[PDB]
Design a protein around this ligand. Structure first.
Ligand SMILES: [Mg+2]
Ligand SMILES: [Mg+2]
Lengths: 316, 316
């Protein structure tokens, strides 16, 4: 059985649904389904429409996989955080905010070590921002969302201040995937595979033309990504999907489990994104300590009372 | 001659008295006297006792000044709002009240621009409240009531998110007045001078170590405050005194007069506090339109029939 409860999130609007899944063994769990058509996903309406037709998107498959984890935990009355190792999240910096002097010091004192920055609009401006971050001694993650090009990327990197270069943990999707271009880009900085993941022919590559695999539990087959990481001796970073609090707790839960199991193979995550939306009933139950998402009350991903209080509509 | 009518206000129990003042020219007017011993005022009993013996607190002097304004208007058959420029008030948020999703968004849609928050109880509990205010895009006024410290205050400000910082209109009495400490505090945020007003050696300072002077018509010498604001090119904010509806209307009347006269020198007000108490006959006659206090029926501050219906006891 699959049932849903719709919701809308307002950026500081987006539509998604929470899912309640029930199995034969009498277990039931919860998960989130939050499509990002802007990133290439089928819309919420289309994914659910397709589901009725019998086809399940990989994103829905992940929602089910997550709901199962939640189900087993609620059964044994444990929280997804239990058994896992705490992990720090990076701070996402939006260039639509005037970096007040001393702010970086504000983040660092509270525990933050890394800042993720969207790159692409203005390289000059962005370069100046990276210099400020480097000046504070913090590490950084550059995300080009595959908009750049091999040439522009090279010129950009080579000309960055000597203080910046060492503090760039990695560059996500520098430009559209190309085996040779990515392989050569590695000479300038560690390269991370995020939105270009589906472009890699895993059963054909002779080696991995990247250093990090970004795993988003909401969309990525976790076991397969971990397998690839171990096969090629890479590192992995777990992120949320700018989704619902339920999706966020699920993501952190996965990250903490991986950190406990694989230690140094797991880098800091990027799941602290619930603050990107205006408070809803669920977000109200979440608390943070700097780069850490604290354990919320309840079992599974928590929100026991809130989830139990919802009217769930039969889906499939 | 001065006469009074006692009253109690019950928070959502405070004692105060309305005053009926008569002049040799035959005019008579009304005002409120509502002490806040919790804020340093002498008690109602003590102020009235001192009055009978020949001394008026500045608060009583203000009540008289207000009663005269009311008397003049009742003679002309005009309301205190007439000729003034309407002014927006901030919303006073309580920490003992849980925010509900969409509430702040709702206020913003009705015209509200700012939220006032009392700080001091719990910085964290309060800091999270500021994030929600920021998330709604509203400005905020923080009132520390001079309980902090130069040190305890600096730690706080630098930690506020890049979304919050630019949304802080100003901080009222961040800590006990000190010229140097306050001057340096201005670097972290604009500072408003409220309850520490009397600690400033006016005709002795070389410059003003604050950005805003808060005027409470119930106890501040208005002309004197305006003069200092003009002398140091500051800004002023007019507020009520968590007092009787009579006091509230009087305060808004002053704010509208100042706004019409000094325009941009006057910031949004903080007089919409009648809902802080359980309904009484006077509050029943007040209406609002979002952040605006609407013109109530009558002359002077209004409430003509209500005031005329009370039995007044001779005081002095
Ligand atoms: Mg990315
Ligand atoms: Mg104050």
């Amino acid at each position: 059985k699959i049932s849903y409860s719709p919701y809308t999130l307002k950026p500081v609007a987006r539509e998604g649904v929470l899912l309640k899944v029930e199995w034969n063994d009498g277990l039931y769990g919860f998960a989130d389904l939050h499509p990002w058509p802007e990133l290439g996903d089928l819309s919420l309406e289309e994914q659910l429409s397709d589901l009725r037709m019998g086809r399940m998107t990989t994103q829905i498959e992940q929602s089910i996989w997550l709901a199962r984890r939640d189900a087993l935990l609620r059964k044994e009355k444990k929280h997804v955080f239990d058994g896992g190792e705490k992990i720090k999240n990076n701070y996402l910096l939006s260039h639509f905010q005037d970096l007040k002097p001393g702010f970086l010091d504000g983040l660092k004192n509270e525990g933050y070590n890394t800042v993720k920055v969207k790159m692409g609009r203005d390289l000059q401006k962005e370069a100046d921002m990276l210099t400020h971050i480097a000046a504070s001694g913090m590490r950084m993650r550059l995300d080009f969302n595959a908009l750049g090009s091999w040439q522009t990327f090279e010129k950009f990197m080579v000309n960055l201040p000597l203080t910046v270069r060492p503090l760039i943990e990695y560059v996500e999707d520098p430009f559209p995937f190309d085996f040779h271009a990515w392989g050569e880009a590695r000479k300038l900085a560690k390269i991370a595979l995020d939105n270009q993941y589906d472009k890699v022919p895993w059963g054909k590559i002779a080696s991995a033309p990247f250093d990090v695999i970004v795993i988003k539990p909401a969309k990525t087959d976790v076991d397969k990504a971990v397998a690839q990481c171990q096969k090629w001796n890479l590192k992995l970073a777990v992120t949320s999907y700018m989704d619902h609090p339920v999706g966020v707790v699920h993501a952190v839960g996965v990250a903490m489990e991986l950190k406990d199991k694989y230690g140094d193979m797991i880098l800091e995550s990027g799941c602290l994104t619930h603050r990107l939306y205006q408070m809803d009933s669920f977000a109200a139950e979440l608390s943070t300590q700097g780069p850490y998402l604290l354990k919320n009350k309840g079992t599974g991903v928590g929100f026991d009372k809130l989830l139990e209080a919802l009217t769930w509509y039969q889906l499939k």
